Design a protein around this ligand. Sequence first.
Ligand SMILES: N#Cc1cncnc1N
Length: 295
Amino acid sequence: MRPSLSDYQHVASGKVRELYRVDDEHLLFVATDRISAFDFVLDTPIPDKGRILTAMSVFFFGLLTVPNHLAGPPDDPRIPEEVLGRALLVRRLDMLPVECVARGYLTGSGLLDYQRTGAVCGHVLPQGLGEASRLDPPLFTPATKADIGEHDMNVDFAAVVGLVGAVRANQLRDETIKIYTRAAAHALHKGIILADTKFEFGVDIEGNLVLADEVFTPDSSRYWDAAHYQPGVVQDSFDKQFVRNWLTGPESGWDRASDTPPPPLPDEVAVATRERYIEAYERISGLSFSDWIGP
Ligand SMILES: N#Cc1cncnc1N
């Protein structure tokens, strides 16, 4: 008999994810079906999104050889029925206060920082780069969380050293680039570019660096279709482009500039978006989402 979610203490709420205490050394990591676009959590959930992204994360944890926070199988009896397939039993870690970002391509705040200064997070780059330019080698572009409604703040390596220690900063940098490089090559082989990604790490009782959070999901990473990769223009979001096009199109009645909360999505846009998530998962994992556990 699976426990009720109400049996666990709620310890943290993020935009799309929830964290619960299971016991002194374990947490329940829960992905929801909520989707964010243009820095708004939208009214309309994407069916099965939490399950698909959990399946994705589990695949990539298994692909990477590095220590990670998983503490049980996806059907672990400590997982409540209501979140089965979109929740994981994980080891509680002392989390390091660094958003560990790898960028293989130049976009978003990385591109903006470069266009303003010629550098990103302390990396002085060649002249002549632009939107969706390939970055080789990939860059470690760490960030720190800001206030509730604010974007993360890009910082340089010295800032990371001041947060976690010199040797630990080195370790974060090296592991971030190593696992990004592996996952990105794997995805591209299957026709998907992982343009960038954001990791969080924690430390266990033995002082070991442990990969936590979710890894290489379309929420933590920019997914692009490789078949349409065209440097110099903004790449479509593999998963979210239908959502973005509808919100900013003539049928939504919404003005992006207004900063007013956007309206709910058409059901058919939500279902199409679910299909994109499944396609990305199945292409990258080589597995069938129909085999992934659920309620
Ligand atoms: N993910 C995650 C996490 C957060 N806080 C503490 N431990 C963890 N494994």
